[PDB]
Amino acid sequence: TEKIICRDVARGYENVPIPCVNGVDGEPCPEDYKYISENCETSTMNIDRNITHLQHCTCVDDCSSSNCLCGQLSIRCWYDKDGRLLQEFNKIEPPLIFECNQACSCWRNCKNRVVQSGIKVRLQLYRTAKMGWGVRALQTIPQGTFICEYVGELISDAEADVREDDSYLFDLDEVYCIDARYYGNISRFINHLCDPNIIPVRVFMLHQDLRFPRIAFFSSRDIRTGEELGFDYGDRFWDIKSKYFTCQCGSEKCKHSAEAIALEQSRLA
Amino acid sequence: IRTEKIICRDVARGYENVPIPCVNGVDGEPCPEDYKYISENCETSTMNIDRNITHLQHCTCVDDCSSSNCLCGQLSIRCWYDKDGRLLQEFNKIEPPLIFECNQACSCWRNCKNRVVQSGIKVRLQLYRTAKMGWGVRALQTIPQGTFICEYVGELISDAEADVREDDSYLFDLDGEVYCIDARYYGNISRFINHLCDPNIIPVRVFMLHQDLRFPRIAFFSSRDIRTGEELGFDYGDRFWDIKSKYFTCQCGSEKCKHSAEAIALEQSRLA
Ligand SMILES: CCCN(C)c1nc(NC2CCN(C)CC2)c2cc(OC)c(OC)cc2n1
Ligand SMILES: CCCN(C)c1nc(NC2CCN(C)CC2)c2cc(OC)c(OC)cc2n1
Ligand SMILES: C[S@@+](CC[C@H](N)C(=O)[O-])C[C@H]1O[C@@H](n2cnc3c(N)ncnc32)[C@H](O)[C@@H]1O
Ligand SMILES: C[S@@+](CC[C@H](N)C(=O)[O-])C[C@H]1O[C@@H](n2cnc3c(N)ncnc32)[C@H](O)[C@@H]1O
Ligand SMILES: [Zn+2]
Ligand SMILES: [Zn+2]
Ligand SMILES: [Zn+2]
Ligand SMILES: [Zn+2]
Ligand SMILES: [Zn+2]
Ligand SMILES: [Zn+2]
Ligand SMILES: [Zn+2]
Ligand SMILES: [Zn+2]
Numbered sequence A: 001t002e003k004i005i006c007r008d009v010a011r012g013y014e015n016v017p018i019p020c021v022n023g024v025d026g027e028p029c030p031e032d033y034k035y036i037s038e039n040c041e042t043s044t045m046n047i048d049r050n051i052t053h054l055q056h057c058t059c060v061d062d063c064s065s066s067n068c069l070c071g072q073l074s075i076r077c078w079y080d081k082d083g084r085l086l087q088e089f090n091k092i093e094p095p096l097i098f099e100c101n102q103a104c105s106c107w108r109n110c111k112n113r114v115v116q117s118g119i120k121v122r123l124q125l126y127r128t129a130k131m132g133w134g135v136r137a138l139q140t141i142p143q144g145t146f147i148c149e150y151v152g153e154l155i156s157d158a159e160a161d162v163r164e165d166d167s168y169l170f171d172l173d174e175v176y177c178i179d180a181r182y183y184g185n186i187s188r189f190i191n192h193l194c195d196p197n198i199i200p201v202r203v204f205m206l207h208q209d210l211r212f213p214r215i216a217f218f219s220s221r222d223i224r225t226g227e228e229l230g231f232d233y234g235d236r237f238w239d240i241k242s243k244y245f246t247c248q249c250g251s252e253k254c255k256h257s258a259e260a261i262a263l264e265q266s267r268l269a
Numbered sequence B: 001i002r003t004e005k006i007i008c009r010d011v012a013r014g015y016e017n018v019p020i021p022c023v024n025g026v027d028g029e030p031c032p033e034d035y036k037y038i039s040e041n042c043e044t045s046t047m048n049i050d051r052n053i054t055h056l057q058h059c060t061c062v063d064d065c066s067s068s069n070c071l072c073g074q075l076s077i078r079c080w081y082d083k084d085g086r087l088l089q090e091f092n093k094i095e096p097p098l099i100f101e102c103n104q105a106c107s108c109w110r111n112c113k114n115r116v117v118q119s120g121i122k123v124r125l126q127l128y129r130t131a132k133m134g135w136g137v138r139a140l141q142t143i144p145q146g147t148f149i150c151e152y153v154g155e156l157i158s159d160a161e162a163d164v165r166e167d168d169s170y171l172f173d174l175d176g177e178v179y180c181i182d183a184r185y186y187g188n189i190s191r192f193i194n195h196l197c198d199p200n201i202i203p204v205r206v207f208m209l210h211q212d213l214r215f216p217r218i219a220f221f222s223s224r225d226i227r228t229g230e231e232l233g234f235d236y237g238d239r240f241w242d243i244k245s246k247y248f249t250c251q252c253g254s255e256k257c258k259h260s261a262e263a264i265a266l267e268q269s270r271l272a
Helices: A235-241 A258-268 B238-244 B261-271
Strands: A003-006 A020-022 A123-127 A133-137 A146-150 A152-156 A169-172 A176-184 A198-204 A214-219 B005-008 B022-024 B125-129 B135-139 B148-152 B154-158 B171-174 B179-187 B201-207 B217-222
Touching: none
Parallel strands: A020 A123, B022 B125
Antiparallel strands: A003 A020, A123 A133, A146 A214, A152 A176, A169 A176, A198 A214, B005 B022, B125 B135, B148 B217, B154 B179, B171 B179, B201 B217
16 A cells, blocks of 8 residues: 655655655665755865856746747747647757846746746655656646756766765766765656657756756656656766666667666677 | 825835825825836946855754754854734844845745745835925834844945935944945835834834845844834834934834934933
8 A cells, every 4th residue: 555654755845845755675765865956065065156147038027929039049948838849849959948047127026937937836756666756747747848847966976986886966967966865855866768758958047057957857748657767878877877777767769678778788798 | 174185006016015105185286206116126336146056054854943963053052933924022122133045945835934034015105295204104004023024125335435425314323344225316215204203113124035244134023913004113223313314303102212303402401
């Protein structure tokens, strides 16, 4: 039987609660990390927060016209009137998104502020059959909807190079990383799928320091209620981890299962 | 003859929890636009604020932070907020302590009892044209003593930078090296609050997402019950008036006014 073990893993820091349930095993709600809703720093990074360094728009409407400078910074604003990615949006090679900011002339409710407005969908941390904890939707989610941000500890690549536990690392684009092992949000629990239903997009909001894009997950297709969320962790992850464990996503397109790995090595010979 | 007109529906452009409208029933001055409204402090040079999460003092509370064991409350002797978010009656309004609110490192939840200022504006205010002092800010409702009103928000600048700025009419001094909040070019609603010699709000230094003591955030709390329609005002202090008295005098109208033309003249006469 599935029981609601924690009413909100985010401790009230998100717009909506994120409960945790486990109907698979005896594992209690995870507590070996610190939930944070926004990225943190553990060393001197000096993110460029100078307000005069922000590119910004002069719109006095809702930023829905093609004349919005912030939209032009990403070719065009990719958000429709409902805050969802346009359907033409390149989900294979996503552009950088520049949302409106505190230097823009527009109001806080304009159409170019989806990610900075936070989580709106109902998500749940749940125990999966084969992959530990995972995150699933508690509602239908149309294609192009903002889900959540990959939040954690900002670290340099040199620091990432010496960290033991690399299971919760997201590479940003000298390069930096978000390590969600010790400090992270709900995204640290999202598993890898070889047939993913969310995609990461690099976004700029209150600063435009190009070393530190913020990573926003949007649905790449319609997601049904109860479906597990997953993104493609990529080849760096799997080149490292395949020798320790194999993919359990179960897709017919799986490239990282024990079977898939074995079939590739057999054709080598 | 002259009617009160609503000139701006919200000077904050939706950035606060509530709209802050602007009205004028005094003169023909339109909504002020010679500044940029920001709801949080901005930086225009490298300030190197200590934002390292491991440097935060934080509590281990598993309740709502109402117990005497909350470290964050202990950092100010005690938590000074009652269950409704208002300062205790014993709060020292003459020399207020530093307040350390709970933060992202504390074990407690976002709704604990020690998070008043970080939750933003809750009272209903209005920017309005005063009779003698330009724009001012007044209450649209009764406000009990001890209630958080708004933060003094603007551009963080060094003492050396403040020393070279022409317009010093919107400066709040923070105090090693010293910093200032300049609300002339970037500011929130607080930039429009006038000076009162009998003030009804007091500034309190508060720490929230960081604890870099060079950069307290300035929170105004009511020092007494405030009536509907009453203009808000704080004591700008002697540095302001030592500079400005030669250009204009106080129009607050209090019998206790210490900066009016009359008060200045009576001091000149007592020398002679
Ligand atoms: C420029 C790349 C930033 N760097 C250094 C890095 N390092 C990883 N891992 C190791 C960390 C420990 N050292 C002993 C060797 C390298 C790593 C592992 C990832 O997933 C298993 C991953 O997934 C997206 C990204 C990763 N990124
Ligand atoms: C930490 C910053 C300390 N500093 C430098 C400062 N300077 C002010 N003014 C002047 C600026 C132009 N220089 C040529 C001379 C000094 C000044 C004026 C204030 O109100 C009229 C005030 O009110 C609270 C605070 C002020 N603070
Ligand atoms: C960022 S975490 C995801 C949350 C994790 N399941 C947990 O319980 O904390 C990454 C780890 O989840 C597991 N995992 C994620 N995707 C997987 C997959 N497709 N197949 C097998 N294990 C997976 C692996 O242990 C991986 O190192
Ligand atoms: C920070 S501003 C306050 C908002 C200002 N009234 C406005 O219209 O922008 C400070 C200036 O307001 C005016 N002021 C504020 N308090 C005053 C007072 N008690 N008596 C006369 N003028 C005052 C002076 O011009 C002063 O330099
Ligand atoms: Zn715009
Ligand atoms: Zn906009
Ligand atoms: Zn904009
Ligand atoms: Zn797979
Ligand atoms: Zn506490
Ligand atoms: Zn607390
Ligand atoms: Zn605390
Ligand atoms: Zn006065």
